[model samples]
Target: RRGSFVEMVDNLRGKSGQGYYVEMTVGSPPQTLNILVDTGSSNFAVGAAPHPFLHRYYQRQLSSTYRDLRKGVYVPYTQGAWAGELGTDLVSIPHGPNVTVRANIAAITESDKFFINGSNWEGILGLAYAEIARPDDSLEPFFDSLVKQTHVPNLFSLQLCGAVGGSMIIGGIDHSLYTGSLWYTPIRREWYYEVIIVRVEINGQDLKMDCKEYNYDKSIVDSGTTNLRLPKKVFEAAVKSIKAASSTEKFPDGFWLGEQLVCWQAGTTPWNIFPVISLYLMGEVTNQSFRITILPQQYLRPVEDCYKFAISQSSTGTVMGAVIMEGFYVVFDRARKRIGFAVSACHVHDEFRTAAVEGPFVTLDDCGYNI
Candidate 1:
């Protein structure tokens, strides 16, 4: 499971990162639109559309300099067909430089289920590199094609900050973007990269109960997954451990679906919610073994047999998202064909500012990564 769609999919855009807009195109003028880059997804899909081209917003939006591929290209997903043109445009990230790269801009002749909101997006920027090599020959990727041309490594990394966030990087780890080291994980040669899961511990509680918990999807760690998705059971155990550590009673009876989301309001605060979740990988990123905080679960109707594990089987299967990736400098060494993860041993944490903040261990529902 890669990234799912959000209400507005609010993300950083523009040179300074202040820009926020949903991907959409106007009427028959067939004008292009402004969009954001998504690392957690492989499908390069876009949102919003109006082929008839009468919308005022469409007329005003500046057309993307990139070329259109709707002529000869047709991408056949399960639902319908995706057709588009190739374009070379400059995509600028916040606090980062601009990247002028090739991309497969979709123009679905008949999107059907393929296009959400029917007119949700002009066309999705499919991240799936495989689709780039279509039989149509006319279709090419907008972002994926930039892989070899630029001196920047093929791998991209996203290190979200406390809330304002550290931001995403394309080529390699920028020293200014984050303060962690570029560790290495031996890469697996597969359709996409795959990482073997050495072990996973939730607050020191083992969650290998799921049939395939031990296996790691290298793509799982890629700049793909957007949110932290844990099996209900493992997540509950981790959240429970944090409750015990904080010396507070959490649940009324059992598991809660409301999702007791926890975050260290400021950057680098000691976890107050859930347990000290640690992922023991086959390799190391920084000097220390990497660690991420798990969001805690407060009072909610608990689910009986909640710990029963299940694997989300699919092309991308179940996943761990940028949620777990926060606060760590994950280096994707495309050169070495390996991956590495490192946390801030620098101990550079933010000052807890509030009218009256509780002690570190007592801070209720304070834990885990944020993006």
Candidate 2:
């Protein structure tokens, strides 16, 4: 039987943007709030005070189970930041694991752009490891507490299906959510679900850059992010390769930068003009590698009559976000210190299949680099 799992509310789908959230009840009586499920960071924070953007906030005083830790907590993301007071409380996910556990909760009193206008979620449920926890790395994250208290398996899996909604299973994997066997890759670091990228390809042709450039700083699989963030040099090469592969004429720089939207005539799509992208990753065993390919439909996001590029350039690291993850059922197998990817069942209903996992092919000795 599935131990603990929850269906995500599709709050940030379609024109609303890209985030998958789950509902959790916190405190004694349990004040329920929608939380953004993020694998990129480690800080289980929620709006504690009323904010213009949030529809609701957690009132800590009302809960007798809440304990004031009196420590200040602050977390900053690529786009937003928040400051809060650290506290402990009985937290339960009625739709999830069902068992209640005392967990760390950051009661956010102030934020900037963290709570977006019209956003449905009131908090963030960080699912990463303890190394990145806010205020201090020694602080235990919510998931860690749950595992220690319940003796459940220390693994979880995610399947984000865009507007159609998805599921997050804790303590086990749902075989029915994915197809075929899962391809596993060793987790390179604990701070993030870090992994190695041996190479990137457009169509079947390699980008031909030094393999080191693929993991210039680092590469991580992050569910919190909305787009596929590539290293600066890698992003440039990909854009160039894509331009060369496409049949379309010259487009504005803003279009590729994701600042400008391109709209075609009604009832038409430009998907055929774009090429598929492949990311070759290091396998669990040395000298072996696998590739996960995402079709144009995944990178070219549709919004009404217009489309936008769902890929971005990053100076820090390459983040595999929703644009890439939506195609596969991703498993964070922390017990074995490896991540797994399999074709998602959602692809069966997709008109343009986006996820394809293949290969354990022999790779070059220097394909993967150390940080």
What is the lDDT of every predicted structure here? Answer: 0.39, 0.83
RMSD, candidate 2, Å: 2.3
lDDT per residue as tens, model 1, 29-148: 344454434333344444323444212222223554544533444456423555543333343333333344444444333344443332322444333345234543334444456574
Model 2 lDDT per residue over 93-112, tens place: 76666589999999999999
What candidate 2 gets wrong by more than 4 Å, as runs, is 1-16, 348-354, 366-371
Q: What residue pairs are clashing in model 2?
A: none
Instruction: List candidate 1 segments past 4 Å from native.
Output: 1-34, 51-99, 108-140, 162-165, 190-193, 205-212, 216-219, 222-226, 231-247, 252-255, 259-273, 284-318, 344-371
TM-scores for all candidates: the values are: 0.56, 0.94
Best by lDDT: 2
Error of 1 at 360 (Å): 28
Best by TM-score: 2
The per-residue C-alpha lDDT of model 1 at residue 369 equals 17
